Amino acid sequence: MQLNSTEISELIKQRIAQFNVVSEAHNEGTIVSVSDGVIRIHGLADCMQGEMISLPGNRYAIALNLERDSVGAVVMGPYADLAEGMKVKCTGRILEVPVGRGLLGRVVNTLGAPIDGKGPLDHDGFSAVEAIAPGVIERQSVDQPVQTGYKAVDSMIPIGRGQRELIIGDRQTGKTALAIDAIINQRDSGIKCIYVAIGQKASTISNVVRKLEEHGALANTIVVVATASESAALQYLAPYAGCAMGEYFRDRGEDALIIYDDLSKQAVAYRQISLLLRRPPGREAFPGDVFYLHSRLLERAARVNAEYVEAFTKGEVKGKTGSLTALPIIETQAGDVSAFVPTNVISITDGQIFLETNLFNAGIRPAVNPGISVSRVGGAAQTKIMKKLSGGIRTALAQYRELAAFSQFASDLDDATRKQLDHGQKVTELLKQKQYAPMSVAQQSLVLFAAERGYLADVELSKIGSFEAALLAYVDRDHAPLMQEINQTGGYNDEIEGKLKGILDSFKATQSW
Amino acid sequence: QLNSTEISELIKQRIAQFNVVSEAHNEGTIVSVSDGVIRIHGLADCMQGEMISLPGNRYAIALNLERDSVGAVVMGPYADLAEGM
Amino acid sequence: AQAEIEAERKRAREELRKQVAILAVAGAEKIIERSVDEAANSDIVDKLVAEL
Amino acid sequence: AQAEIEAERKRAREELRKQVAILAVAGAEKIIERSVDEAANSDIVDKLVAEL
Amino acid sequence: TGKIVQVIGAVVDVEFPQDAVPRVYDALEVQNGNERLVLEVQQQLGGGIVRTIAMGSSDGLRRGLDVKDLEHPIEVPVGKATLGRIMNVLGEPVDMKGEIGEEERWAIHRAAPSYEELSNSQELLETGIKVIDLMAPFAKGGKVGLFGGAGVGKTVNMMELIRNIAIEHSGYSVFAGVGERTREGNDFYHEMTDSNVIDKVSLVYGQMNEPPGNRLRVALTGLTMAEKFRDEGRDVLLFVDNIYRYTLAGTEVSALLGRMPSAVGYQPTLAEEMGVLQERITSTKTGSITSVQAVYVPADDLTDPSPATTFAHLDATVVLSRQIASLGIYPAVDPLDSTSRQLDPLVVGQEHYDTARGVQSILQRYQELKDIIAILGMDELSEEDKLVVARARKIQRFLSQPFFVAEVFTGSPGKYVSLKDTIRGFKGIMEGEYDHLPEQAFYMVGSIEEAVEKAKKL
Amino acid sequence: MATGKIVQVIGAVVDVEFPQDAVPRVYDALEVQNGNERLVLEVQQQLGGGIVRTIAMGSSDGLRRGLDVKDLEHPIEVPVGKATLGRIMNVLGEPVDMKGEIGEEERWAIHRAAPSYEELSNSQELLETGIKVIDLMAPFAKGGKVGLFGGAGVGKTVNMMELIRNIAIEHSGYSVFAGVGERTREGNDFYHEMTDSNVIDKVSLVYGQMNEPPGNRLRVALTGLTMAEKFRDEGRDVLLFVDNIYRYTLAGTEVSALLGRMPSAVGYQPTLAEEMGVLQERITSTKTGSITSVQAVYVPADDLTDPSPATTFAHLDATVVLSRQIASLGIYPAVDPLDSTSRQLDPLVVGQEHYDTARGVQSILQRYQELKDIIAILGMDELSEEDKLVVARARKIQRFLSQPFFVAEVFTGSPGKYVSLKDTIRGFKGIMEGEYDHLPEQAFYMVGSIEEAVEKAKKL
Amino acid sequence: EFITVARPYAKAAFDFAVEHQSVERWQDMLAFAAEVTKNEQMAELLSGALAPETLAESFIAVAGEQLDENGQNLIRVMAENGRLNALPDVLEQFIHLRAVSEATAEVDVISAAALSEQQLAKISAAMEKRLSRKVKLNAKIDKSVMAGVIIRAGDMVIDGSVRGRLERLADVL
Ligand SMILES: Nc1ncnc2c1ncn2[C@@H]1O[C@H](COP(=O)(O)OP(=O)(O)OP(=O)(O)O)[C@@H](O)[C@H]1O
Ligand SMILES: Nc1ncnc2c1ncn2[C@@H]1O[C@H](COP(=O)(O)OP(=O)(O)O)[C@@H](O)[C@H]1O
Ligand SMILES: Nc1ncnc2c1ncn2[C@@H]1O[C@H](COP(=O)(O)OP(=O)(O)O)[C@@H](O)[C@H]1O
Ligand SMILES: [Mg+2]
Ligand SMILES: [Mg+2]
């Protein structure tokens, strides 16, 4: 159908027609050195720091130093085919990236160039990659909830719009699953998503994008990719180029969610770039400002009050408050949660979800270790019902998991500890959850109701999952309006508490499981 | 390649007369100031550990007698000092 | 759908052969202000057509 | 599969645009180099020095 | 009159005519396109060159830009007019309100008060936190420091100290946020403003967004405000939200200034940079400054040069620890590592001192058994060393307390525990008079009667 | 025509000065007359003023300053295609055996970009090795990397020969073997073990052993990998063996130190995780073909945190570990089923039946692990009588994991067996759930399929 | 490379030459010194560690076209610091500082073939409305460009060529 040659021909000829032939004057220099991806340029009097320099071929380098007699730069691409004596031309543009809601559904290079085969971008101008976050008076406190699909994190570790929430754990623990499930769950909740993959294997991206398209989420996500093969500079500047696309929605009073696949591989690529410039390293050989690197990046995930959205948008938007939510992912060796880069990013975000390999080996997935994981905004983000049914559940389990330590060889206070153990054990058996199975807040809510009003004192551990699977279908047949209502509002009243007690008695007393 | 306090007008002085006159040898001029260390140009007759006397009522210790400079540490607040004193 | 696309491809390509010459002449005449004719260049445009 | 067919249509349309695009300029170069003369050269140089 | 000749990251080099070279620490000014950028000169290289740090984003600086010389250091508003307002590092107002109506402006680089003018006081400050004022009591006009790694509680503890001492005290207060989250600055601005105590607090912010120069000098700006209030004969509170970031911003810039690296990459001038600040935050015969400083320790390494050089500059040091917070025992203070200059029989009385030392001794004896308990299990211990373990494990829980600011996290209402009411309770536990209770009767309670009561509920 | 001149020689590093207008691009190859034989230099960096710093792919003894250097305009190129099967080559693609010239028709550069994002295969298949333990406990992805962690004396090379055989016979693939920095003795008595098992005709060998200078041990893996990429372009399935990836890392570190770059984390080069990625990323499936890789790995100081193990494991899909103990019991291949792992074991990828069969045998074995300690301390008679049956099913499982390789005949006499996955799933689903309780445990040993276990019990 | 270490010496020599109105002699002096630097034998001497005073004397002796006091003193001062190899760059930066002070410029004009000498007139006229300097053209012939003209003035260039017009279009697509 849509291979209309008329359309292609005009698509070209309109570009031809508006090609401004008029010549123009620019500033020019010579490449003097090339090594390990660093370029030393000679001339360019009117260069400026952070400027994009245009090399032969069609590729760019970024000015890092303006030495007295030369400009140090890094090449954003394959650097081998360059040679001393090539002329470079200074554009006037500080490092920039395309932005706009026309990027949604595209897979994009860190420079904005599209990488799927679907042709040129449609974008609303350009945005500077390096920018300073809104000030202390332009922020607003985070209030609105961001639902993932998971009972464990939505109950124990709530996330709000405008929050920053580290996902940390050892390799092969579900760090990426827990992130793309959050992306998938925004399929219908008006939050745009952005997923930037730094240093990942190319096949892993090719698979993640297939899952995103499978569940219908791709039409709502940008994707930025800098695979393990690509230059250190492209891997280092990727997450800034992702934040530059999230801030487009933030500053218009819309909401966005951005997921940095590894802020640990960004630190490694920056350590490379830094050691190739001979900068004295510090702890673990990381440069001095490896903190400022992540700091100026994550400080952009913010929520901004309506006066700032009015001032930014020339008054076209009133009353709406934008926000950008970040879930940076860190990886830690041998579960050591206390190393330089892992601790540096714990000291930047607003909480962390710690996924533990010991739990993940024992089938407890998502392996959310409670007691080490926290949310610094806490219940302020949760919906009213979830804030009620949850209570201090996470400290109940944090206690339970050390009670099991000493209660191993014996049990004393041996009635209340017996009930406490058999309770928390069914709780943990309830919090595990299959991949790609996001359950709405209505379902999570009445599940936590069943668990926390004692309604699971009866059934066996074995039956827990079948209890849930039958309960969620019962209430989908018989009580749809109540789900339709709890999903629409925070929806906590003693009226609804009675409705739930009645549903959970009726089910409990006649349905099979 | 790095410079070593070969700066325009000192070089020009030496252009005019390479065989420079004595200039006392008990006097020099501060050419650099940073973090409490001063680099003094001249003082051919400085001795290691000698007290060098600065404007105001202050002193420095000459520690790095070197081919071109005498690198000395200020015994007090240094931010007042200025090149050319 | 793959077979449908692979047929539509030929359908579009063969008529794009008729537009390539307009594109090349419009580009030349934009870059050069002195407009130009077909006769001096027919054997050149025809090669483009033959290589689409 | 309704989305994986559409991705293939978009991608084929893009590749076709790409080929026609490079042929346009590759031909325009030959047209120019075949159809220049010193009057055409003078016109351009004298236009551009007048905005120098 | 000046020209730029280099731009390396944050530091810019400027060339001036031979006779007009600026002094050290003077402020220059440049126009970074359609904006204005302020530079502070750090070093006078030779031949008119002068090397400076940019108090702003360095992006967009060409070489060869003209720079104007302002012939005075950075100077900030100060005094009564700076009260209830948020200010930049450069002393500019950062809330959207009007211009600051200051009568007077002070240079942020000053010398410390003479030894002849200092003063000292044994007058205790009664904070409501059991552990802090049992193990580490601190006095009016003295320095406190909270040491801990990321996410251990050194901000929430500082906010509870603010709540307890800062409102129950009349004089002014200053809060200098150095290199920490802007979210936690906005939430604090609004917590103040929504209770009409904002107009006794002066705020200064150089949060983590900002380029190294702002984080480098903001703490000195806050100090200068506090010092103006002190010289007026008042008595002030000064809270500094992370002093580690001053030294970290010094490190980030040191190597560009051409200085050889030292122990773990730290600048060679670490201890002098740190002392030139901490020496001017002190009380004196004319007025007093109480202060509380959060001190991040990187990688939880209490022997890294940066905490190691800071320990010396504090009167009361409170050390938080992750291996206690992970037990849920907040505030996660380590009582075998907290200490105070004020813990003397002559200052706190014999009974307080004796209770604090008995607690230290029991907890230490418990530390020495943890390896025997680990390897062999607990049933090998004596009848007199199972009792030590039980009493230590009760004292550990009873050191925990609910905070009026952690209600956000756990709902449980905060408690305020007076000093008499805790040196009674720990005496009670150590002498076995509460041996008939379970350990959980002590977790997150206030005075000892709340534990004897919570035991009834099991 | 020669245009350069050597201007420094320091160890393996050679600096040559060209005219301003002809500096070689990076990774290009030069050559010089090092006396009575030519020497090839690879360009690493372009310094100012026409000087270019290179590393010699050979011995730098005897090089004068001022020698004339001829600039080849292309990177190092090696012979590829069918012609290289059964041959030995060094980094530069010269026949190291005595069998004369390679008749190759085509030669490819060794430096290349990885497959672009949309060339990758839009699927996720499985590679059927035909080995019970591997196909069950640690299946291979078609296009994935596999680590092989066992020690010495356990049979790593007989397993490699078995895979080389099966991927040639059952599928229609070819194999490439790149020996990076390992003992020449091993290379020789591997060549001879393969030649007298008829597999030599189906594998192409490229060895750059410990004796070679740093550059050879650095680039030999890329030579092997580009020959494998040529086979892939023919639409085949290829199997690429890297005889020790840790030595590739260490050659990178040596060269990095020669070039004067600052030391990174534990002395490792600053560019470690990129030198690793730019190798490991060319080993992928593709819409035309695929390369699977089996990589022997050595972990320094028994530390899986050291930057090199931690950088490699980021790329490995599977992981099979060979145990001295499993071999002590006369079970071959000695794949430890409890520590061997794969990330293809998920119900999503391999299915629910395979997944839970593997998890079943794993739980059985690791319970037997402790019952066999209770036995050793208290004697058999203490065990409960359901455990006396777990200890009878675990022994049958542990036997059934043995297999007769074709390559193993000249040890074991018995002919070889190639077991289709489905048959392994059948056999273990059987043994696990009491079926075949009635027949003795030695009827499973070295049998192959299970429907031959019964027909070995028959005559027992 | 000497680009940076040659700056102070070029500036000092130029400043000295201006006070004494002998710039035109100093330029010949420096050029001859930079020439004796390029000799095959002298380049060997300059590289092998030899005491600065002896190197300076043995370099002076090889010149007689040097101003007895003020020319040779520059040689001795550079010898003290070992920078005698820098002379070929001290020369370039001397010429450049002179071209700045005299407010003179030099611009390349690159064309497919020779121009019409009225085009040259208009170019050498308008470039001085761009630049405050007097200009000396140096036309060049380049067939890679196939029409139009390139005007390069230092490190600023105005790309009026058709080749530029082509590759500035092929990239729009
Ligand atoms: N809720 C779940 N239930 C069962 N399995 C899960 C769940 N979440 C994740 N997994 C499994 O965990 C495995 C690894 O997950 P994932 O790739 O997200 O971890 P990762 O840390 O991103 O791995 P890497 O560190 O290599 O990127 C996946 O194969 C997936 O099957
Ligand atoms: N007294 C307390 N009660 C309950 N939870 C606490 C308490 N102190 C800290 N926490 C938890 O630990 C986290 C500590 O945050 P914070 O004190 O800001 O750490 P830091 O400032 O040291 O990085 C808080 O988000 C909170 O969830
Ligand atoms: N499948 C097998 N069948 C029979 N014997 C085997 C088998 N695998 C290993 N072995 C025995 O173990 C030895 C391992 O030797 P080898 O493969 O050379 O070890 P390495 O891996 O160190 O080269 C064989 O020579 C043989 O004795
Ligand atoms: Mg992952
Ligand atoms: Mg804090």
PDB file of C-alpha atoms and ligand atoms in Angstrom, chain A residues 346-347 374-376, chain E residues 148-157 181 184 330-331 401 403 406 409-410 444, ligand 2:
ATOM      1  CA  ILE A 346      22.940   5.378  46.817  1.00  0.00           C
ATOM      2  CA  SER A 347      23.833   8.823  48.126  1.00  0.00           C
ATOM      3  CA  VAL A 374      13.830   1.712  51.267  1.00  0.00           C
ATOM      4  CA  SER A 375      11.877   4.559  49.703  1.00  0.00           C
ATOM      5  CA  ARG A 376      12.888   7.991  50.929  1.00  0.00           C
TER       6      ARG A 376
ATOM      7  CA  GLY E 148      28.015   7.660  58.265  1.00  0.00           C
ATOM      8  CA  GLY E 149      27.888   6.081  54.817  1.00  0.00           C
ATOM      9  CA  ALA E 150      25.105   6.538  52.277  1.00  0.00           C
ATOM     10  CA  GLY E 151      21.535   5.946  53.511  1.00  0.00           C
ATOM     11  CA  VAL E 152      22.297   5.447  57.255  1.00  0.00           C
ATOM     12  CA  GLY E 153      20.335   8.398  58.737  1.00  0.00           C
ATOM     13  CA  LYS E 154      22.593  11.416  58.997  1.00  0.00           C
ATOM     14  CA  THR E 155      20.004  13.694  57.408  1.00  0.00           C
ATOM     15  CA  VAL E 156      16.995  12.467  59.378  1.00  0.00           C
ATOM     16  CA  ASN E 157      18.988  12.787  62.588  1.00  0.00           C
ATOM     17  CA  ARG E 181      19.641  17.000  47.004  1.00  0.00           C
ATOM     18  CA  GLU E 184      15.489  17.821  50.373  1.00  0.00           C
ATOM     19  CA  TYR E 330      17.192   3.604  64.059  1.00  0.00           C
ATOM     20  CA  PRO E 331      18.849   5.942  64.867  1.00  0.00           C
ATOM     21  CA  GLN E 401      13.697   5.550  69.345  1.00  0.00           C
ATOM     22  CA  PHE E 403      11.369  10.152  65.591  1.00  0.00           C
ATOM     23  CA  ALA E 406      10.175   9.308  60.664  1.00  0.00           C
ATOM     24  CA  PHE E 409       8.174   6.138  57.131  1.00  0.00           C
ATOM     25  CA  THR E 410       6.493   4.175  59.922  1.00  0.00           C
ATOM     26  CA  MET E 444      11.091   1.513  69.188  1.00  0.00           C
TER      27      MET E 444
HETATM   28  N1  LIG H   2      14.880   7.331  62.554  1.00  0.00           N
HETATM   29  C1  LIG H   2      14.469   6.643  61.468  1.00  0.00           C
HETATM   30  N2  LIG H   2      13.339   5.916  61.482  1.00  0.00           N
HETATM   31  C2  LIG H   2      12.929   5.237  60.404  1.00  0.00           C
HETATM   32  N3  LIG H   2      13.580   5.221  59.238  1.00  0.00           N
HETATM   33  C3  LIG H   2      14.721   5.912  59.083  1.00  0.00           C
HETATM   34  C4  LIG H   2      15.236   6.676  60.214  1.00  0.00           C
HETATM   35  N4  LIG H   2      16.368   7.257  59.799  1.00  0.00           N
HETATM   36  C5  LIG H   2      16.558   6.893  58.512  1.00  0.00           C
HETATM   37  N5  LIG H   2      15.580   6.088  58.089  1.00  0.00           N
HETATM   38  C6  LIG H   2      15.483   5.521  56.736  1.00  0.00           C
HETATM   39  O1  LIG H   2      16.775   5.570  56.157  1.00  0.00           O
HETATM   40  C7  LIG H   2      16.874   6.593  55.178  1.00  0.00           C
HETATM   41  C8  LIG H   2      17.985   7.532  55.597  1.00  0.00           C
HETATM   42  O2  LIG H   2      17.952   8.693  54.791  1.00  0.00           O
HETATM   43  P1  LIG H   2      19.006   9.842  55.103  1.00  0.00           P
HETATM   44  O3  LIG H   2      18.990  10.063  56.576  1.00  0.00           O
HETATM   45  O4  LIG H   2      18.723  10.983  54.180  1.00  0.00           O
HETATM   46  O5  LIG H   2      20.411   9.189  54.722  1.00  0.00           O
HETATM   47  P2  LIG H   2      21.671  10.106  54.347  1.00  0.00           P
HETATM   48  O6  LIG H   2      21.162  11.510  54.499  1.00  0.00           O
HETATM   49  O7  LIG H   2      22.650   9.669  55.389  1.00  0.00           O
HETATM   50  O8  LIG H   2      22.080   9.758  52.943  1.00  0.00           O
HETATM   51  C9  LIG H   2      15.555   7.325  55.160  1.00  0.00           C
HETATM   52  O9  LIG H   2      15.056   7.431  53.838  1.00  0.00           O
HETATM   53  C10 LIG H   2      14.613   6.469  55.955  1.00  0.00           C
HETATM   54  O10 LIG H   2      13.800   5.721  55.059  1.00  0.00           O
END
